[PDB]
Amino acid sequence: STHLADRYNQAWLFAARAHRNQTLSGSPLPYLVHLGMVANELLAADRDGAIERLGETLQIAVLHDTLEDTATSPEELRQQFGEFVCAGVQALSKRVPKRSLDDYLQALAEGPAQYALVKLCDRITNLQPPPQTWNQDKIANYHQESQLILARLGHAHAATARRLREKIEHYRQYY
Ligand SMILES: [Mn+2]
Numbered sequence: 001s002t003h004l005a006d007r008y009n010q011a012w013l014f015a016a017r018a019h020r021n022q023t024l025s026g027s028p029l030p031y032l033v034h035l036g037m038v039a040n041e042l043l044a045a046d047r048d049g050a051i052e053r054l055g056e057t058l059q060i061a062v063l064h065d066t067l068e069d070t071a072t073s074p075e076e077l078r079q080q081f082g083e084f085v086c087a088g089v090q091a092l093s094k095r096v097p098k099r100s101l102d103d104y105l106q107a108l109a110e111g112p113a114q115y116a117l118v119k120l121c122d123r124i125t126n127l128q129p130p131p132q133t134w135n136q137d138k139i140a141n142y143h144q145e146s147q148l149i150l151a152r153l154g155h156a157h158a159a160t161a162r163r164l165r166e167k168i169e170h171y172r173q174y175y
Contacts, residue, residue, distance in 0.1 A: 002055070004043075004054065004055050004058065007055035007056070007058060007059055008039065008055075008058050008059065008062060010059070010080075010081070011058070011059035011062035011063050011081065011085075012035075012039075012062050014062075014063065014066075014072075014080065014081075015032070015035055015062050015063055015065075015066060016032055018066045018070035018071065018072050019031045019032060019035070019065070019066070019069070019070055022069060022070070025131055026130075026131020026132060026133055026134075027131070031065070031069075034065075034125065034126075035061075035062055035064075035065070037125045038061045038062075038064065038118070038121050038122050038125045039058055039061040039062045041061070041121035041124055041125055041160075042057060042058055042061040042117070042118060042121045043058055045117065045120075045121060045157055045159060045160045048159035048160070049157055049158060049159050049160075051114060051117065051157070052114065053084065053114060056081070056082065056084050056085050056088070056114075057088070057114040057117065057118060059081055059085050060085055060088035060089060060092070060114065060115065060118050061118050061121060061122075063077065063081070063085065063088075063089050064088070064089055064092045064118055064122060065092075066089060067089050067090065067093045067096045068093045068094065068095055068096060074086050074089075074090060074096070077089055084112075087111075087112075087115075088112070088114065088115045088118065091107060091108055091111055091112075091115040092108070092115060092118060092119060092122070101145065101148065105148065105149060105152035105153060106152065108152070108153055109152045109153055109155070113155075113156040113157070114156075116153040116155070116156035117153075117156040117157045117160060119149060119153055120149070120150075120153055120154065120156060120157060120160045120161065120164050121160065123146055123149050123150075123164060123167075124160070124163055124164050124167050126142075126146075127146060127164075127167040127168065127170070127171050129174060130142065130174050136175040139171075139174050139175040140175050142171075143168065143171050143172060143175075146164075146167075146168045146171065147168060149164070150164050150165055150168060
């Protein structure tokens with residue numbers, strides 16, 4: 001089926017199995033908590049500026065951490081979701097040799113805008129209140145990194161860029 005919800009379910013079930021028994025950062029809740037919010041950000045973003053290839057991009061949102069933290073291979077993503085989804089997850093993976101942030105963001109900035117948009121949604125989601133065990137320095141550093149993500153990637157989707165900027169501004173209160 002081409003239906004947006006069927007595409008999400010396929011990716012969502014795959015991600016739930018891949019991230020089985022993985023948790024959040026600074027919480028015992030399932031890592032799935034994170035993916036639900038990123039995917040929902042993406043779908044919400046479409047309402048403020050339509051996205052080309054929305055269904056695949058929503059799958060990328062759901063799947064964006066599979067290569068970096070699960071036993072998922074690129075070949076599985078390609079066979080089950082297509083090359084565009086696979087390339088999106090790869091673009092969003094720093095490590096599947098960890099790429100430096102500058103190279104990582106530059107490749108997202110120069111590639112398909114949908115992939116950069118997923119990163120904006122990822123970072124918006126990660127600018128919830130920091131985990132209880134981060135000190136001021138670590139929270140401050142996360143703010144700095146977020147600023148670079150907005151600078152390099154905000155071009156991808158204006159409404160989401162504005163939302164990321166507001167989340168970045170609001171984040172300064174946590175330190
Ligand atoms: Mn993420």
